[PDB]
Structure 1
Amino acid sequence: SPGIWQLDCTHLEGKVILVAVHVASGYIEAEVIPAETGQETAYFLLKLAGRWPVKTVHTDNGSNFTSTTVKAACDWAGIKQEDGIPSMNKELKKIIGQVRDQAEHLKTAVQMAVFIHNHKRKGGIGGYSAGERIVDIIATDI
């Protein structure tokens, strides 16, 4: 449960957003990238894995993820790929829409949407944000 991420892509304004979701908490990492190439995907994963302890990624089995470039990055990071193995994503497009007019460029609106997402309290004033849940799940001591 703590090491499992789901990667998905979304296409917005003719641009591609790569989204990684930490399945257990709802916490997200996201980046606008040039196009869905093996090198861009490898580089996103290497960055994700250097920040969070990533054991397994579930992917949509796109051509970017069957490349040897991505397989190699995953081997180097000790990440197991599960390609093709099983709509928050809609609310991210929503959030991006509600910050869009404070930033000139899509990439800035994406990072603002990431911030709002990971800070939002889910389940009422009684609840926890994704950012709070992920550290809770992942922490090894107290």
Structure 2
Amino acid sequence: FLDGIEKAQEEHEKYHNNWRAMAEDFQIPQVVAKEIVAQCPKCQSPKTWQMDCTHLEGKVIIVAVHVASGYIEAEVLPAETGKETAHFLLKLAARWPVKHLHTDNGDNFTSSAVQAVCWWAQIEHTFGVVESMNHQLKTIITQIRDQAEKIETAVQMAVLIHNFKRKGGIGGYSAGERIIDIIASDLQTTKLQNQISKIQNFRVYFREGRDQQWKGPATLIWKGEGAVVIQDGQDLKVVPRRKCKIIKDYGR
């Protein structure tokens, strides 16, 4: 265990690994490897979307693309006013976690209805991939046009073919597997951060071997069944539980 912590610290000193790889290799828990990463001085987006509009056969299409995976949601608008763009933004924010929106300096994107929707849904709007996605979507639309009667059915069938039937990239996945994996990794990071702060609200007085004095207040990191990992003086050490006293610390 302590040999695992020493090997992990030497391995991060050489190669600067990440905490998932160290937790899998050296068989240490995740909070300890995250603290090893958090102590390195040389080591210190999944919710950004881009929106645009286009024209196709006299219809006004609006396209929203998740940037980090290439995930497309499209719709056919009856006009190009601000209320319909605000309604499309409200549906998009109600289905996926949207935290940062990037648009161009158009008329309908600079409107009081879109600003009210961004205020109620807590989205940061920023004015300046989407043109390449519009080009690829129009190629698919002209490829499967003869199987539909209206234009909305062709738009939604092209969205389905782009999202789940086209595979590429490094691992050979589509866009839906990429966006689900990215958001799941971010969720794991936030849950681990909550556990880290809740554990680190404590304090430990420990007694060394062949001594009867209590030592300085070291910060608790991991409280096991028989072992306790503490940080003191930029050093991690493992003390057994029968030589330690854990108190609360109100030191904000």
TM-score category (smaller protein)? over 0.9
Separation (CA, whole Å) in 2 of partners of 1:42 and 1:24:
23
Question: Counterpart of 1:121 in 2: which secondary structure?
Answer: coil
Separation (CA, whole Å) in 2 of partners of 1:37 and 1:82:
19
Question: Where do 5+ consecutive residues of structure 2 fail to align?
Answer: 1-44, 190-252
* Percent identity between the two aligned chains: 72
Alignment of 1:133 with 2:186, yes or no, is: no
Deviations 1:88-110 (A, max 9, x none): 21010000111211110111100
Question: Counterpart of 1:94 in 2: which secondary structure?
Answer: helix
| 1:29 counterpart residue number | 73
| 1:123 counterpart residue number | 169
Q: Which has the larger radius of gyration?
A: 2
> Which letter does structure 1 place at the counterpart of 2:60?
V
What is the number of residues matched between the two proteins? 139
Question: Counterpart of 1:43 in 2: which secondary structure?
Answer: helix
Alignment of 1:5 with 2:45, yes or no, is: no
Separation (CA, whole Å) in 2 of partners of 1:123 and 1:138:
18
Q: Is 1:56–1:80's contact at 8 Å kept on the other side of the alignment?
A: yes
Deviations 1:69-93 (A, max 9, x none): 0000111111111122xx1210100
Q: Is 1:96–1:113's contact at 8 Å kept on the other side of the alignment?
A: yes
> Alignment RMSD, CA only?
1.4
Deviations 1:37-61 (A, max 9, x none): 1100000000001111000111112
Separation (CA, whole Å) in 2 of partners of 1:40 and 1:141:
35
Separation (CA, whole Å) in 2 of partners of 1:20 and 1:122:
21
| 2:139 counterpart residue number | 94
| 1:108 counterpart residue number | 153
Q: Is 1:65–1:83's contact at 8 Å kept on the other side of the alignment?
A: no
Runs of 4+ residues deviating >4 angstroms: none
Question: Where do 5+ consecutive residues of structure 1 fail to align?
Answer: none
